[PDB]
Amino acid sequence: SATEKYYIRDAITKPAVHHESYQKLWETKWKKPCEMGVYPFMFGSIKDFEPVAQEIIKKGLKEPYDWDEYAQMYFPKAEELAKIAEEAEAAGEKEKASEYYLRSSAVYRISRFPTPRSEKQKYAWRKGCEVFYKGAALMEYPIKEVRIPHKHGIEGEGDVVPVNFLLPPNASETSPVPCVLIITGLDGYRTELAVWQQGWRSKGVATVIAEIPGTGDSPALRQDPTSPDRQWSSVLDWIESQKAVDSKKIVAWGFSTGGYYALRMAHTHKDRLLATISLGGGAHHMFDREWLEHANKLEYPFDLSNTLAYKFGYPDLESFIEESSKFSLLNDGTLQKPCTKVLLVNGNDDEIFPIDDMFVSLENGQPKLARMVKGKKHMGEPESFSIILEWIHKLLGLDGKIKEQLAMIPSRTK
């Protein structure tokens, strides 16, 4: 009984209105964050998305979505913005060029939400990365792609871990800087969580942003629970080779599904990490039949359980549920291992991963730091962001100007 099993009880059986139509997704969930320029609309403008949303609403698109039909609706706006960026860059208008390339990247991004599962969505991922990096190259402090050799890779794995890298300008072997390794989620990849990098640069902190297995350009085997372990060995080896970065001050911050990987690597890579943070992560119950058979209809904008199944390399939900127990940090013995410093943060009412997974994390191995956010769903925002920045600032002895750091996240566009 799902209603008996989990902290949120009968909330698990109440289908969210945004699943009725794209119109309801826009009106009740997406219009607000788009207006505010925040996830999933970082670098984005209401001016770009509003006319796309109007055309989708007119068509009356709804679940089950044809992802090629859905994705195509965004391309005219994405192409328009890229054209404006190109003309700006030709005129030497670098700030305008950077803004419009990044606005283009945001439109391509939403077109391949929740994850690229069609040819046009895979195309939108490639196109989105292209215009993202064109915009990033034109930032005052350019964010660059590093194609980290996946030296720890096995048969069937890609040869590179593509990451974002930003080094603060004063960083050197004389004055080496901490590094925040941002682990992205099921739908937000390195082109999304990029929004955090300039804020960390301002505090004198390097940033590396990497995708979880079965998302973005992760080379990791989708179905292999140990595939993330090899990926982080390759990433951390590369960070160790950057002498401007203090290898003893690496903090891994996992966002959403990334939180699972942050919690996992606190154990698998204990000796190589100062600390890890799981924000809206899971560990065990996220893989339950009962949780996954309900989560498709809850707070996630689309079909969470099917999307998670695809990310784990299964062609349907049932095939994933058959094998999903093997990914549990409880079942595979991860949580019995010693860990580095761990902070767990989430909203109690999370309908993407259960708060019950915070409890499983606190029931096993060494004590861990926790902040629960009462009456808030996935991520427990915005207080979760302040809690985590406060902790990382204390840990790394930063300037404590966290409100200013958070105020830098919302997108400004013309």
Author numbering: 1 to 414
Give sentences from the paper:
A common step during their assembly is polyketide trimming, which Afyg1p, Wdyg1p, and PlAntI catalyze. In summary, the N‐ and C‐domains in all three enzymes are oriented in a back‐to‐back fashion forming an interface that encloses the intramolecular binding cavity next to the active site. The catalytic triad is formed exclusively by the α/β‐hydrolase domain with the nucleophilic serine located in the consensus GXSXG esterase motif. The resulting Ser‐His‐Asp network is perfectly aligned with distances in the range of 2.5–2.8 Å between the active‐site residues.
In contrast, in the zoonotic pathogen Wangiella (Exophiala) dermatitidis (Wd), the acetyl group of the hexaketide 2‐acetyl‐1,3,6,8‐tetrahydroxynaphthalene (ATHN), WdPKS product, is hydrolyzed by the Afyg1p homolog Wdyg1p. Single‐wavelength anomalous diffraction (SAD) was performed to obtain experimental phases for Afyg1p, which was used as a model for Patterson search calculations of the Wdyg1p structure. The N‐domains exhibit an α‐helix bundle, whereas the C‐domains adopt a classical α/β‐hydrolase topology. The amino acid sequences of Afyg1p and Wdyg1p have 40% sequence identity, which explains the similarity in their overall folds and active‐site residues (rmsd = 1.1 Å over 382 Cα‐atoms, Figure 3b). Although both enzymes differ significantly from PlAntI in terms of catalysis and primary sequence, their superposition shows a perfect match of secondary structure elements (rmsd = 1.6 Å over 244 Cα‐atoms for Afyg1p and rmsd = 1.8 Å over 247 Cα‐atoms for Wdyg1p). Interestingly, both hydrolases provide a hydrophobic tunnel beside the naphthalene specificity pocket. The 400 Å3 cavity of Wdyg1p is confined by the amino acids Thr257, Leu304, Leu308, and Phe353, which could accommodate an acetyl group. Hydrolysis of the Ser256‐bound acetoacetyl group finally restores the catalytic center and releases the products THN and 3‐oxobutanoate. This mechanism is most likely transferable to Wdyg1p due to the high similarity of their active‐site architectures and the GLDG binding motifs. Notably, the entire reaction in the hydrolases Afyg1p and Wdyg1p happens in an open state.
